[PDB]
Amino acid sequence: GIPLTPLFSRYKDSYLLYSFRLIDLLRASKSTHLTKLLSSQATYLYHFACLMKYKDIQKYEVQQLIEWAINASPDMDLQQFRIEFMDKTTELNLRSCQPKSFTYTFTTIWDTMHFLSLIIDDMVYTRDKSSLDFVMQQLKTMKVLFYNVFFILQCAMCRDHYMNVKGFIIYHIELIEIALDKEKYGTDITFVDSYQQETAGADVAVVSNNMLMKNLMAYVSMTFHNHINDYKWIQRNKKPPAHYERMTWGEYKKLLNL
Amino acid sequence: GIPLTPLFSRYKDSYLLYSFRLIDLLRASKSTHLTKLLSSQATYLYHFACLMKYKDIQKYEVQQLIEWAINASPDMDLQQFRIEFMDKTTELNLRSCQPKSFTYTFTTIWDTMHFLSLIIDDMVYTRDKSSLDFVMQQLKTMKVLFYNVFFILQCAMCRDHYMNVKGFIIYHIELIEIALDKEKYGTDITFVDSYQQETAGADVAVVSNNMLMKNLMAYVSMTFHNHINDYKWIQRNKKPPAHYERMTWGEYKKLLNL
Ligand SMILES: Cc1cc2nc3c(=O)[nH]c(=O)nc-3n(C[C@H](O)[C@H](O)[C@H](O)COP(=O)(O)OP(=O)(O)OC[C@H]3O[C@@H](n4cnc5c(N)ncnc54)[C@H](O)[C@@H]3O)c2cc1C
Ligand SMILES: Cc1cc2nc3c(=O)[nH]c(=O)nc-3n(C[C@H](O)[C@H](O)[C@H](O)COP(=O)(O)OP(=O)(O)OC[C@H]3O[C@@H](n4cnc5c(N)ncnc54)[C@H](O)[C@@H]3O)c2cc1C
């Protein structure tokens, strides 16, 4: 139930490009351990792409795609892998998982993280349908995706920094788990409009309060994204550029029609 | 400039007990790598104990204490190490670093984390004195302390969970670094009373706003502590006990006279 907007369309495409570049790494994997980690990450990523598009995951078709990527020739170049990827996904009836744009940049990875955040918010708000158990399983998978992020591009500094602060995101996913658990035991979730209301609601001695900010992960990922960009100037020991600009929640909500 | 209260007194003692138990591990270290990690952690811990007590770190005396612990007999039992520790610290004029209580529990580690949080808040509010550079260095050390936490007691589940969410704490330390950097470049820090005000202040497109919650780390560590205890019921797949009780900011501020 995510609003259709130009930005969300870009997020979807970026997410598919990221997943495509991730499976392209399988044939070049330097170890069984890495192949396993990459294959699992890819399986989960495509699962969420299909959940939104097909309102279900094509566990079978996705597995066939991943199996194909694992066995693809390592001598093959990216252009050839692209071509064979398009043919394979067409054959597997996964045309909706094909990227339209192939320009890979940091925006691609950020877009991917923001896309997953919107999925989390949507799966929770519409939990009326699958089941609290299904959602809980999905959140566990989301934590694995965020605990493990493959940059594909090279940036050791980014990797080290993310290692240090990724817990900020994971912490909020756990807040959702707690809210769902409270609902299982009798207290329905009350959605609020601001992060401030959620913070105030959490400042109690009892567990009978169950307030959760609507669009929480969208806000959390936006805030995290701003933080990384605010901190890079400290990493470079420099004053931020005169035209450095941060994203505001009001602007972000408008862009995604939240 | 931390208020003297019964709770803070307990925090101080717990912090010293934690540090004592950490250096007791040196003589039993299974590798040079571990000895280095433990020695560095211990050096930083004692540095902050002395900073508060002696308004400076006894880099020399602390180094002598650590060197002593590294060379202590591995066959020695904890009671004997205690005795020799008391004699060594007396000799090194570090009597103020001697624990009064020796009962080690999870409370000991939590107290240690809350103590460091109060130190961070105090060093920042009174930055008028050392220098922005000194404080920045201290914060870097604090991040290392929180990125690395030795439980001493055994709890693999705790370790794994902390690994996943410690970024929530580190994220807020980086927020302080950003605030100090903004001050270096011309914008003084404006302290606010609530986390909600800090959140609202951060929701801007410019970098000219520099609002920081007073007692931020005290609030962050309290919130984190509540979160870990809220989540353990999910880990155990059980409803929280009927008498489970959480800490509130109002109660916490009163206990520490913040
Ligand atoms: C997980 C991760 C960690 C990183 N760690 C580091 C690091 O430690 N150091 C470092 O130097 N670089 C790091 N980077 C890269 C850095 O965040 C920027 O992507 C890069 O410097 C390029 O900046 P940019 O000016 O092109 O903007 P980008 O941030 O790349 O912009 C990408 C897109 O996101 C939009 N956008 C900007 N801010 C927000 C927001 N808050 N919420 C939503 N959309 C927004 C932009 O409008 C644009 O369309 C990291 C990237 C990722 C994905
Ligand atoms: C970093 C860390 C991670 C841990 N991870 C796990 C885990 O994943 N799973 C698990 O089962 N256990 C975990 N634990 C242990 C758990 O947090 C408890 O300490 C333990 O279960 C004992 O609970 P208790 O009821 O004795 O209260 P404790 O939380 O141990 O109480 C210690 C003291 O802190 C006070 N206090 C309580 N809440 C707060 C608060 N929010 N702020 C400040 N003071 C407060 C109490 O009043 C008491 O004096 C972890 C401990 C630490 C230090």
Residue B250 Cα distances to B113, B254, B257, angstroms: 19, 6, 10
Are the C-beta atoms of residues A2 and A109 closer than 8 Å to each other? no
Q: Please tell me the distance from the alpha carbon of residue A19 to that of residue B166, in angstroms, as a whole number.
A: 28
Q: Is the dihedral of CA B235, B241, B247, B248 positive or negative?
A: positive
Give the technique used to solve this structure. X-ray
Ligand nearest to the CA of B245: 2
Select the residue from A182, A184, A193, A207 to test the B interface by mutation, using most B Cβ atoms within 10 A. A207
Are the C-beta atoms of residues B24 and B66 closer than 8 Å to each other? no
The alpha carbon of residue B231 is apart from the nearest alpha carbon of chain A, in Å, by 7
In chain A, residues with a C-beta closer than 8 Å to the C-beta of B178 are 230-231, 234
Does the C-beta of B157 come closer than 6 Å to ligand 2? Answer: yes
> What are the domain boundaries of chain B?
1-258
Are the C-beta atoms of residues B230 and B246 closer than 8 Å to each other? yes
CB atoms A170 and B165 under 8 Å? yes
CB atoms B245 and A178 under 8 Å? no
Tell me which DSSP letter residue B212 carries.
E
Task: Find the helix or strand (DSSP H, E) in which A213 lies.
Answer: strand A211-213
CA of A140 to the centre of ligand 2 (A): 23
Helix (H, G, I), strand (E, B) or coil at A255: helix
Best residue among A163, A228, A248 to mutate for probing ligand 1, ranked by most atoms within 8 Å of CB: A228
In chain B, residues with a C-beta closer than 8 Å to the C-beta of A206 are 245-246
CA of A110 to the centre of ligand 1 (A): 6
Q: Please tell me the distance from the alpha carbon of residue B167 to that of residue A171, in angstroms, as a whole number.
A: 8
Residue linked to tokens 């997020």: A11
The alpha carbon of residue A168 is apart from the nearest alpha carbon of chain B, in Å, by 4
Are the C-beta atoms of residues A172 and A166 closer than 8 Å to each other? no
Strand partners, A190: A211
Chain B residues within 8 angstroms (CB to CB) of chain A = 143, 147, 164-171, 174-175, 177-178, 181, 185, 195-196, 199-200, 202-207, 223, 226-227, 230-231, 233-234, 239-240, 244-251
Q: Which of B79, B18, B25, B9 is nearest to B44 (CA)?
A: B18
Q: Is the dihedral of CA B138, B143, B145, B146 positive or negative?
A: positive
